Amino acid sequence: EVPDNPPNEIYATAQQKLQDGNWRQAITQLEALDNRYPFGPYSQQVQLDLIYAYYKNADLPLAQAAIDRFIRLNPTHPNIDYVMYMRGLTNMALDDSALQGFFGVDRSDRDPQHARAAFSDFSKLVRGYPNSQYTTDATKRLVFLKDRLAKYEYSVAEYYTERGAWVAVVNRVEGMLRDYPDTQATRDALPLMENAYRQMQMNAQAEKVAKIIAANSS
Amino acid sequence: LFNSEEDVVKMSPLPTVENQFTPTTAWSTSVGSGIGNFYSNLHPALADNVVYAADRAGLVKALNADDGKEIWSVSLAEKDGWFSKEPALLSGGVTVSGGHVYIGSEKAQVYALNTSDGTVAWQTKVAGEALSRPVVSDGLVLIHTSNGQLQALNEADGAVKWTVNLDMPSLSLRGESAPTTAFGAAVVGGDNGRVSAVLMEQGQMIWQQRISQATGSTEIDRLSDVDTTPVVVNGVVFALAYNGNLTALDLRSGQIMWKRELGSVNDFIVDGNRIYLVDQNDRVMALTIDGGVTLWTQSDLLHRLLTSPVLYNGNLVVGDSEGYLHWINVEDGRFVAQQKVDSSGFQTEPVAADGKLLIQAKDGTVYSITR
Amino acid sequence: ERVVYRPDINQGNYLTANDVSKIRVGMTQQQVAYALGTPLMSDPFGTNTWFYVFRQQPGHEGVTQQTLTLTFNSSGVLTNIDNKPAL
Amino acid sequence: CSSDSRYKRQVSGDEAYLEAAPLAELHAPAGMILPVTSGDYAIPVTNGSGAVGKALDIR
Amino acid sequence: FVVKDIHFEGLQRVAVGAALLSMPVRTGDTVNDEDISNTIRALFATGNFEDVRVLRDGDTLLVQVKERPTIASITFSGNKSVKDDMLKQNLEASGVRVGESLDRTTIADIEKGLEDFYYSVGKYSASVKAVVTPLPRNRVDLKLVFQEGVSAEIQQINIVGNHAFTTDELISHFQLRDEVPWWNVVGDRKYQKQKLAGDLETLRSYYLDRGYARFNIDSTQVSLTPDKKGIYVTVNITEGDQYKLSGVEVSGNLAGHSAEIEQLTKIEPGELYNGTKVTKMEDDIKKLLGRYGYAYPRVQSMPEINDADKTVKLRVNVDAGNRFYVRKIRFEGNDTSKDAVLRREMRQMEGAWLGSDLVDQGKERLNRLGFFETVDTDTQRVPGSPDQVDVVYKVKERNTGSFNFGIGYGTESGVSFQAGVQQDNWLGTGYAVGINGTKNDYQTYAELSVTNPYFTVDGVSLGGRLFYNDFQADDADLSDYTNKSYGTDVTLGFPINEYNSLRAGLGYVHNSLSNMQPQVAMWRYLYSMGEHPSTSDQDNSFKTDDFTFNYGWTYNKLDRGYFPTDGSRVNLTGKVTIPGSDNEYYKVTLDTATYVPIDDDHKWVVLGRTRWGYGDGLGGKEMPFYENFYAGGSSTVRGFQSNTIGPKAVYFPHQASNYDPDYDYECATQDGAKDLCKSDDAVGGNAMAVASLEFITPTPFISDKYANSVRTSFFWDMGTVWDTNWDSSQYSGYPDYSDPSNIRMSAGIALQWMSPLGPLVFSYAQPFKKYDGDKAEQFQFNI
């Protein structure tokens, strides 16, 4: 809703329910500014505090629209580094939908498109704002975020090994190769392309990979 | 029961119902359903004291203009089309001239019926459908059709002298510009909010004059039965633009002599400088030809569905498509007679001819009216 | 085995007998790629060995495969039409 | 109550993105080295460290 | 004159300095009397300044401004059937919204665009007025009023140039139609201008298939009739003097499939022209070349329209693509389903030439998957080589979880409950998991049913099913019908065709009964079992460990698993006992799911289900009475109560259940009904004959926000279950079933609503023919 007060009295009541943690009425009072005073100056700060509201309210796609709002309202701001961190942080929290994370059936054999979107925005933080406090964290998220897709592409390279389409198995390992070397799963894919070679009787070409295996036995 | 099912918009009934002078009917010979509840630009003729009556079902009559005594009869139900003795389906009106009752059908055929018996003394296919009544004159059959053609057929047999596409609107924007033959010029309006003079003799456009607006990018009235047919007294051509905007303009150039580019004026008669009308709210008003200077005004017909006004028995007569007849004063709009001789609603205009006042309505069919 | 039913594992990327006749050892990659297009597998770290490898399983017993490799040199010029059969 | 595997905590996802670690990489012989960094998932890294996780700020 | 400052007042969207840059009297610039008036127009050109009163204190500027911005609300009134956002989309087409700058000149332009909407929607007969309601600081409410008269409606369609077809029979193959009589009711009708254009191409097809290759529609004239409802149509066409398809001149890049293309172009020379067939036969090549790899089979026909004999010869310009467009494929929309589970539900393999069907063949399996909401993709043509299409299978999955409700009354009393959840292929990871069970003060029942359909990648459905029903049925301790039943039936399904698949399993039926009821049909099974326990008491135990072999076969010819509509899946089940079984019996069971579209738009489809089966002893025994058949109420027959279809058990003249509750749980005992007592619960028959016919039915007042995955269906659920071992020897005193004439019947409508836990079918059915003691709960709610 829009409980319309004076804009600061909106903003104070926007700020208070954030301090309460009641984001639902913080969002209600942060909406009280940006619907009555979107020409309000701290509507940017409202958009920042809305991400502090939404994401902590588990309103992560509403945070994501508020992320793009602060991006569209401020193409330049020194608080985009919060937002561009929060952007991928939304897009990695866009992943979690069900309790497969406990079971070891966690989303790294699953739909990666938000996670690959998170790989952009986490890196768009570190490249667009290397000055941030958030930069080495998104880098640490990015450290996982090659490897989420690695086991996901390994799960594809698993599948075509089960399918036995050894033309295709080479290519999924090749995509596992050409993106991330610093995944052991790619070096676990290193027998698998070499496997696909021998199943297509490219043993000597597999032997080239066996030398790579002999090199990446180190 | 049915109290909570549907939803319409406002329409006003008849106020000021006065019949201090009594109206009546002279007879009510009633040829079936006439024009029908469906829309057709057919209209009966009352000529030679012979009620040249009809229906789009086929049964074309000659009734006596003293009692509706049947003089002749035929059936123009089409025997041999697609579906095995199809009805007549007449588009163009009853135009009786020579040994030819020129009637355009919705089979895209103009039938010219021998007025002695009603047998088709010639028939010919039309182009499109006759948006206008057949204005058959000078050996030509002049209709502005649905596809905007200016036809001329050799009215002895229907040999097409020309067929020329004139001002044809974006759709079939319904407003009848009957091409009225006058002063060596084919004078006809335009449902593009325009008007034109064409050559009478060969169908050669003397000028076409855009006057006011019409449907297509300027959404104007559809219910407005604007008389885009010019009623042509002299080199000042009097006609309506398709949005109900009246003009008086030069016959030879198209230059406006005076205008009433105003309202959504539907039906108009030019009784010298007494232009009696039917407005969009059916408000009857008397205008000059000296301008359209308002002489009197009556909205005692409010939101009716009127026919054309006519001075008959000393009073301005207007019927409606509710079925009421009204005797408006020739001066300011006093009902002198009000006649509910129909309830099916006069779709056609009164024929103040042969001593009678003839309407064949939708099912209030042929009604000779006296008072 | 003893199962009465077996669907078929099926993938192309082959080269026809017409496809071998278009080209020759010496005919460069591009010159092959106008006749044969790209491969769906090339030597991914070394030379230009354009693998066109057919692999198909026709039922319970038997396997059908046409492993064609095209070792072009570093200059693009073909050095090897290795139209190797199944197994 | 009684559980082999933490009966109250089975939630969708964890903090493993913060617990992330890079893995073993190419030592391949020459001519057998592939352009393994050509995809973006060789992680374009800049630094400037600051806080991590929940220690990061919320404006 | 030079400005020293300007007085920036009343803006509401424009800033103070943002006003200044639109002022040519901006602070520091020289100020002319033209710049005063140039500040009038340019601050008007902000679009946000309602009045602009450029004045100066000598030359010290001050611009008194009232303002256009925030439209604080937009209100709608009288738009009963029209969604107001459609009205607001015209307002959004006007660039106007809540919180916008309201020009008070474009008020009618909105009402233009609302009437232009009313024009285009199928009316014109309505009126709109934007009611400006002024609100504080400048603001405005855009109240909108809607006085709807009527929609325009089709009256008459004249077609001239038609000569060989009736315009009336033209309409009978057209979209635009009229006439709901009381001789053939078809339901009410209206007008839309888009139904014209299809009916043009309905007619364009209608002459093309006949031969008329000179057929052309000249024009059409919809009467803008002086009634504002009359839609009379005058079409001009030219019929087109039917042409004879006299031969084909197909050539071009035929890709070596020229005779194969010629098989598709097997036409009769001199047959009447059917260019719609010619359209399809091009696509026949496109399917042919598409399955031959050629993802771009450019096939262009050309009718050599030879008017001199009224014939058409047929040039056809063919250009195949390349073969190996299937480089790789991508998968998406699988965040709680593993890709390889879905990837193995696909037939087109990477590193291949294109099979045009194998994508959809896999997608049909993914349609027959059923745990989706949309199975779709992105066939991404990768440029760079015509060996490159990377098909991104982005699908929409379905919900998971399926609960079955049933309860006495719990948490205010003793905890007695029926539960059960079905995982809908658990985590989408190749484990079809459905679990049920119930623990009461009356039973302790557990059960599992889990299928790994691809434990082995051939299609080996790893279907494990176990149970333990400690059904105790407590009067006080065990006195009425206690049975501890338990055991195993692990099952396996194998590929036999892509439509045929057989079933096999091994059943361990271990039951532990005590205090058996005086109902006679129980004892005649016991007397065929060799036991002869005491009829007049429940002091009778039964400890049986039966060992059965189970079998069956499913047919697979039907559209979907999520919303199937056409075809038939015949799914055999059956069981037989083995040497080692504590009872020697058998049972087969026969059910149908036949899907016949009576409406091929599939808003009405015959849904043919039946139920059959027969089982008896396997020598010396009977089939057990708990293995007999049932229906009625909680079954495919509803409107009844639980198990009304089957023979009816009659208690022996009975003394004691080893405990009789105080004139409660009466079982013909000494403590009530001290005689034979009959029951109307269907104890079951060894033969089943149940059939109901369901029919898809659309929903008229339900938005397709939620009408799509749901369906409504009427039925006539009747049936007959009888026991061939139910005699009439002393059963002459009882209801007597030994024939298929025990015709029960109800009829009613079922309401499949798909919840976030899937479809939960609720219903009403009404019995009008009840056979031998049926209990009726006409309101039936199921899952």
Q: Neighbours of C (≥3 Cβ pairs closer than 8 A)?
A: A, D, E
**Interface probe with E: pick from A94, A109, A114, A202, most Cβ of E within 10 Å:** A109
3-state secondary structure chain B: CCCCCCCCCCCCCCCCCCCCCCCCCCECCCCCCCCCCCCCCCCCEEECCEEECCCCCCEEEEEECCCCCEEEEEECCCCCCCCCCCCCCECCCCEECCCCEEEEECCCEEEEEECCCCEEEEEEECCCCCCCCCEEECCEEECECCCCEEEEEECCCCEEEEEEECCCCCCECCCCCCCEEECCEEEEEECCCEEEEEECCCCCEEEEEECCCCCCCCCCCCCCCCCCCCECCCCEEEEEECCCEEEEEECCCCCEEEEECCCCCCEEEECCCCEEEECCCCCEEEECCCCCCEEEEECCCCCCCECCCEEECCEEEEEECCCCEEEECCCCCCCCEEECCCCCCCCCCCECCCCCCEECCCCCCCEECCC
Contact C41 A165 (CB under 8 A): no
Q: Tell which E residues from 423 to 482 touch A, by Cβ distance under 8 Å.
A: 427, 429, 457
Is D8 an interface residue toward A (CB < 8 Å)?
no
The answer as to CATH 3.10.20.310 being correct for domain E71-151 is yes
Strand partners, E421: E403, E435
CA distances from A50 to A137, E39, E299 (A): 21, 39, 56
* CA distance linking residue A27 with residue A22, whole number of Å: 9
Q: How far apart are CA B293 and CA B300, in angstroms?
A: 20
Query: Cβ distance E341 to E428 under 8 Å?
Result: yes
Judge contact between E73 and E127, C-beta under 8 A: no
d(CA B160, CA B165): 14
Cα separation of C35 and C14, whole Å?
A: 13
Residue B271 burial (CB < 10 Å; 0-12/13-18/19+)?
Answer: middle
Q: In the 8-state DSSP scheme, what is residue A99?
A: G
A159 Rama sector, left if φ>0, alpha if ψ -120 to 50, beta otherwise: alpha
d(CA E195, CA A31): 44
Q: How many residues are present in chain C?
A: 87
Pairing, β C48-49 against β C64-72: antiparallel
* Number of neighbours of residue C66 by Cβ within 10 angstroms: 18
Q: How many domains does chain C fold into?
A: 1
Look up the domain containing B214 and give its range.
1-371
Residue in E218, E217, E274, E216 with CA at minimum distance from that of residue E243: E274
Q: Chains contacting A with at least 3 CB pairs below 8 Å? A: C, D, E
Residue C1 inside a domain? The answer is no
- Two tokens, residue E328: 């790789």
For residue A76, what is the DSSP state? S
Contact call for D28 and C45, based on CB within 8 A: yes
Nearest-angstrom CA–CA distance, E510 and E438? 18
- The angle at the Cα of B255, spanning B250 to B259, to the nearest 5 degrees, equals 90
Q: How far is CA B47 from the centre of its chain?
A: 16
Number of DSSP helices (H) and strands (E) in chain E, helices first: 11, 37
**C-alpha angle E387/E391/E397, rounded to 5°?**
170
Could you tell me the fold of the domain covering E153-238? Answer: Ubiquitin-like (UB roll) (3.10.20)
Residue E266 has, within 13 A of its CA and on its CB side, a CA count of 4
Taking the CA atoms of residue E652, residue E657, residue E660 and residue E663 in that order, the dihedral angle to the nearest 10 degrees is -10
**How many domains does chain B divide into?**
1
Determine the Cα–Cα distance for residues B341 and E408; give it in Å rounded to an integer.
75
Comma-separated ranges of CATH 2.40.160.50 domains in chain E: 474-781
Please say whether the beta carbons of A26 and A10 come within 8 A: no
CB contact under 8 A, A111 and E457: no
* Contact assessment for residue B191 and residue B175, using Cβ atoms and an 8 Å cutoff: yes
Q: Is residue C2 part of a domain?
A: no
Encoded tokens for E207: 């002459």
Q: At CA A85, angle to CA A84 and CA A91, rounded to 5?
A: 90
Q: Taking CB atoms and an 8 Å cutoff, what residues of chain D touch A124?
A: none
Amino acid letter, E775: K
Q: What approach was used to elucidate this structure?
A: cryo-EM
Between positions 17 and 76 of C, the ones with CB within 8 A of D are: 44-46
Whether residue C32 lies inside any domain: the answer is yes
How far is residue B5's CA from residue E224's CA, in Å, rounded to a whole number?
28
Nearest to E224 by CA among B214, B345, B223: B223
Mutate to test the interface with A, among E46, E74, E336, E425 (most CBs of A within 10 A): E336
Sign of CA pseudo-dihedral A51, A55, A58, A62: positive
Which chain C residue has its CA at the smallest distance from A163's CA?
C9
Among all residues of chain D, which has the CA nearest to that of C47?
Answer: D31
Contact status of E349 with chain A (Cβ, < 8 Å): yes
CA dihedral (B135, B136, B137, B140) in degrees, to 10, reads 120
Identify which of C17, C30, C41 has the alpha carbon closest to the alpha carbon of residue C78: C30
Which chain D residues in 17-46 lie under 8 Å from chain A, judged by CB atoms? 17-18, 20-29, 32, 34-46
d(CA E393, CA B125): 60
Count helices and strands (H / E) in chain D.
0, 0
Q: What would you measure as the largest C-alpha separation in chain E, in angstroms?
A: 125
Which residues on C lie below 8 Å from E388 (Cβ)?
Answer: 38
Of E99, E335, E344, the CB nearest to A35: E99
Query: Long-range contacts of range B181-185, CB-CB < 8 Å, 24 or more positions apart?
Result: B181/B135, B181/B137, B181/B138, B181/B140, B181/B142, B182/B232, B182/B251, B183/B232, B183/B234, B183/B235, B183/B251, B185/B251, B185/B252
Chains D and C touch (3+ CB pairs under 8 A): yes
For A204, which residue in chain C has the nearest alpha carbon? C43
Say whether E550 sits in a helix, a strand or coil: strand
| H-state helical runs in chain A | 7-20, 23-36, 43-54, 60-73, 80-93, 113-128, 135-145, 147-163, 166-179, 184-199, 203-215
- Cα E774 to Cα B51, E522, E645, E741: the distances in Å are 77, 20, 8, 15
Residues forming a β-bridge with E73: E141
Please provide the DSSP assignment of E13-69 as one string. SS-HHHHHHH-TT-TTSB--HHHHHHHHHHHHTTS--SEEEEEEETTEEEEEEE---
CA atoms lying within 13 Å on the CB side of residue B136: 27
Instruction: Determine, yes or no, domain membership for C4.
Output: no
Nearest chain E residue to C34 by CA distance is: E385
CATH number corresponding to E326-397: 3.10.20.310
Whole-number CA gyration radius for chain B: 20
* Closest CA in chain E for residue B168: E221
Q: How many CB atoms within 10 Å of residue D58? A: 14
- How many Cα atoms sit within 13 Å of A128 on the Cβ side? 20
Q: Is D59 at the interface with chain A, CB within 8 A?
A: yes
Which residues of chain E does C38 touch, with a Cβ-Cβ cutoff of 8 Å?
A: 384-385, 387-388
User: What is the DSSP annotation of E386-454?
Assistant: TT-EEEEEE-EE-----B---BS--SSSS--B-EEEE-SSGGGSS-EEEEEEEE-SSEEEEEEEEEEEE
- Say if strands B59-64 and E542-555 run parallel, antiparallel, or are unpaired: unpaired
Top CATH class, E244-319:
alpha beta
Would you say B312 and B357 are in contact if contact means Cβ atoms under 8 Å apart? Answer: yes
Q: Show Cβ contacts of residue D28 under 8 Å, excluding neighbours closer than 6 positions.
A: A211, A212, A215, A216, C45, D34
Among B319, B306, B326, residue whose Cα is nearest residue B223 = B306
Residue C36 covered by a domain = yes
In Å, what is the CA distance from E214 to each residue of E204, E219, E312? 11, 15, 10
| Residue A213 contacts C where some CB pair is shorter than 8 Å | no
Q: How far apart are CA B152 and CA B134, in angstroms?
A: 10
Residues with Cβ within 8 Å of B235's Cβ and at least 6 positions away in sequence, in order, are B183, B250, B251, B252
3-state SS, C19-81, equals HHHHCCCCCCHHHHHCCCCCCCECCCCCCEECEEEEEEECCCCCCEEEEEEEEECCCCCEEEE
Determine whether E758 is exposed, middle or buried from the number of CB atoms within 10 Å of its CB (0-12, 13-18, 19+): buried
Q: Which helix (H) or strand (E) holds E208?
A: helix E194-208
Find the residue in E nearest to C33 (Cα). Answer: E385
Q: How far is C29 from chain E (nearest CA, A)?
A: 13
Write down the residue that tokens 């083995």 correspond to.
Answer: E578
Q: Which residue of E has its CA nearest to A40?
A: E13
The residues near E389 (Cβ < 8 Å, ≥ 6 apart) are E295, E325, E326, E327, E354, E379, E380, E381, E382
Contact A94, A64 (CB under 8 A): yes
How far is E79 from D51, CA to CA, in rounded Å?
55
Q: How far apart, in whole angstroms, are the C-alpha atoms of residue E270 and residue E309?
A: 10
Chain E nearest CA to B5, separation (Å): 12
Q: Which residue of A lies nearest to C44 if distances are taken between CA atoms?
A: A174
CB pair distance less than 8 Å for D24 and A126: no
CATH 3.10.20.310 maps onto chain E at: 8-66, 71-151, 153-238, 244-319, 326-397
Rg (CA), chain D: 19
Are the beta carbons of B234 and B183 closer than 8 angstroms?
yes
Instruction: Enumerate residues 6+ apart whose C-beta is below 8 A from C56.
Output: C8, C9, C10, C11, C63, C64, C65
User: To what resolution in angstroms was this structure determined?
Assistant: 9.5
H-run or E-run covering E144 = strand E140-151
* Residue E334 near residue E397 (C-beta atoms within 8 A): yes
Collect all residues with Cβ–Cβ distance below 8 Å to A56 and sequence separation of at least 6: A21, A23, D58
One-letter amino acid at E200 equals L
Comparing CA positions, the residue from E607, E618, E629 lying closest to residue E720 is E629
- Rounded to an integer, what is the distance from CA E729 to the centroid of its chain? 51
Q: Which of D10, D26, D37 sits opposite A216 (nearest CB)?
A: D26
Helix (H, G, I), strand (E, B) or coil at E134: strand
Residue E363 DSSP code: H
Distance CA B315, CA E603 (A): 62
For tokens 């005058």, what's the residue? Answer: E234
Chains with 3+ CB–CB pairs under 8 A to B are E
D4 touches chain A (CB under 8 A): no
Q: Do chains B and E touch (3 or more CB pairs under 8 A)?
A: yes
Instruction: Give contacts of C46 with chain D, Cβ < 8 Å.
Output: 31-32
Using CA of residue E760, residue E761, residue E764, residue E770, what is the dihedral sign?
negative
**Residue whose pair of structure tokens reads 């959809």 in the numeric block:** E360
The amino acid at residue E671 is D
- In angstroms, the separation between the Cα of residue E777 and the nearest Cα of chain B is 33
Cross-chain residue pair D49–A135, CB shorter than 8 Å: yes
Give CA–CA dist A140/E402, Å, rounded.
39
Angle, alpha carbons E398-E401-E404 (nearest 5°): 130
Q: Give the CA count within 13 Å in the CB-facing half-sphere of B369.
A: 34
Q: Give the rounded distance of the alpha carbon of E219 from its chain centre.
A: 41
Residue B50 CB partners (closer than 8 Å, separation 6+):
B62, B63, B64, B65, B71, B96, B115, B354
Q: Which superfamily, per CATH, for E8-66?
A: membrane protein fhac (3.10.20.310)
Those residues of chain C whose CB sits closer than 8 Å to some CB in chain E are 3-7, 9-13, 33, 37-41, 53, 55
Tokens coding E581: 């079984």
